[PDB]
Symmetry: D3
Subunit: 63 residues, 6 copies
């Protein structure tokens, strides 16, 4: 199973490593997939490049 | 955050619903993100359109021994 | 540039055609890119395969009150 | 509605912010989606990593 | 590595199988990656959902002269 | 035809340029697509952000 998670920049090394373990466990538990068959990519996006309601997360945090 | 999952066709509806919930719990506990801020999109690919080693999952299934 | 849109199933053909045009005009005006250099791909997801808060759009629709 | 735009690196901060506003307006106008329901990610790609006709945009600009 | 291809609908099964193999050989020779480490996912888009210049491939096909 | 290749960071400039040429040739050969109609994006992912079996490629290399 392939999993891509896109989230905001600024996460700790712990958080990214934890996320990759935990998403893998979730797929293994719910689908029966061997853990080695679960592949995860974490993509981090700067807050100036993520918009909700037409305003960036960087602006929404400021305003 | 956005979680996009690519799976082979043929999982049951109950397994897909359980996966959505469990991936969401995993992002909640590890990142602190509220569950309502986590989105999951599950895409299913037919086995003729997924290749490993240059051969489709369908072809690899037809010769596994 | 490439614009990939993910939408729930059920939009009309006319709305999808109008979206493609309008996203293209938006990229043209803001970036200067010629319209012919903008590509848009629209993907439709069934509501059983889109989750928010760990529950599918289908499940959230079945209990909205 | 979720929108991912991939474009070449080197855009100004104005251009990215403008793009996120304008794509959001387009989705709101054409689908009736509340602006808060439109989410946009802008991904920027270095010109050495985008190919057309088997040559990078960086090479095509040089040559 | 992961190779995701987006194609218009309508290619034959034989062409899609040949593409998967050939993209895999290309990644093997240029990167050194073993073939079994290369995955290819082929996605097909209907021509009403692919836009260039703000018009769908279907619309551009209906007026090409 | 559009092709996105995600692979690990650390590739040489030769390797990325070669990959973009070779993937383009493969699409041209197998589909009959004019080379100018083949578009390729190469995305590079740090090894700490790619997981197999719940462990990052960075950890798997160390351990």
């Amino acid at each position: 199973p392939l999993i891509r998670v896109t989230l905001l920049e600024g996460r700790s090394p712990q958080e990214v490593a934890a996320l990759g373990e935990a998403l893998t466990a979730a797929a293994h538990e719910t689908l029966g997939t061997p853990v080695e068959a679960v592949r995860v990519i974490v993509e981090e996006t700067p807050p100036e490049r993520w918009f909700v309601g037409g305003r960036s997360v960087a602006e929404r945090r400021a305003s």
